[PDB]
């Protein structure tokens, strides 16, 4: 890829998310950087609107897989970076098990030399007393697997996968992610064979930040074929 | 022109601008200046591999174990990125060898992961804890096996 070369060294990152769940309206901003040689991402995020209505861990997944580490042996399956710099669209529907769903649309691309992720998020059919909207997930994130299927039908990427969020009491809430990525440009692009992405993450709070916010450290590697 | 000396210094250390760093220091800039995220000139010079700036910042008393919001210290950055001499120097100036980023990585963790043998060796020599575990219970040994770096694994085994 010519597009992979663009991820040599440290690239700053901007993130903007416009949101509505069961009609509660909100906005999130983040910034930081990433380093795709080591799958590393170093971010902080602010709710510009007030209290955030949903819990911070619901958003993580929605708040730039261009930064995942693909090792030499798996470079030919790195779709996200081959679509650079014109970028890609990334659409998702995320079903929470005994509760509502999120639908997301995102454009991920280079503006300037900044890798920017701009997001619209619609959530519906949530329970005002359930886990989400009742703030009942803990401030927490585990290590997950993200399976990538080639999606020739659209010149992109179909992806199932599932993440689990710990609830305050020992219980676990499943979030079933269905994903579609298509290129913005019509340049050639790489269509992956099936693989897992494996993650580590850590959520933290900045001492001198008064607004509702999440600090996020995250490492990501493509680990294998199916 | 003489406004915002701290930002100007952060920038200069990120961009490896040695002549600007000299000026800024000799002309009063805070050597421990930090942005919103606790990033400091020394973090930036350690990450980007700019040794002369690292040496200079430490001679004006740069806090060698300053911590950004992701719990990283300049030692983690240099050890991730592979800057052997910079690692050497930060250790000689009392860098905390078993410091923790927010995933519980130590710089040994980071260095074994990223495939930097000589940096590992050097961290072991300065007192690194071989059994130490990240928040997902990995060790620098595992991480090294995860990544296929046998000689690093072979090494970690012996301590």
Numbering used by the authors:
A (entry chain A): 2 to 64, 68 to 230
B (entry chain B): 10 to 168
Sentences from the paper on this structure:
DARPins are engineered proteins that consist of 4–5 structurally similar repeats that stack on top of each other, forming a compact protein domain. DARPins combine all potential advantages of single domain binders over antibodies: they are small in size (ca. 18 kDa), possess high biophysical stability, have very high expression yields in E. coli, can easily be genetically encoded for in vivo applications and are devoid of disulphides and hence well suited for applications where they are expressed in the reducing cytoplasm. Structural investigations showed that these DARPins bind to different but slightly overlapping epitopes.
Surprisingly, SEC-MALS revealed that 3G124nc had a dimeric fraction of approximately one third, in contrast to the original 3G124, which was predominantly monomeric. 3G124nc did not show a clear transition up to 92 °C, a stability which is not unusual for full-length DARPins with three internal repeats and an optimized C-cap. All hydrogen bonds except two (GFP-residue Gln204 to Asp143 and His114 of eGFP) are also found in the complex structures of the parental DARPins with eGFP. The structures of the GFP-clamps confirm the intended design: both DARPin-derived domains overlay well with the parental DARPins when superimposed on eGFP. Most interactions between the DARPins and eGFP are found in the single DARPin complexes as well as in the GFP-clamp complexes, confirming that both domains can bind their respective epitope without strain or steric hindrance.
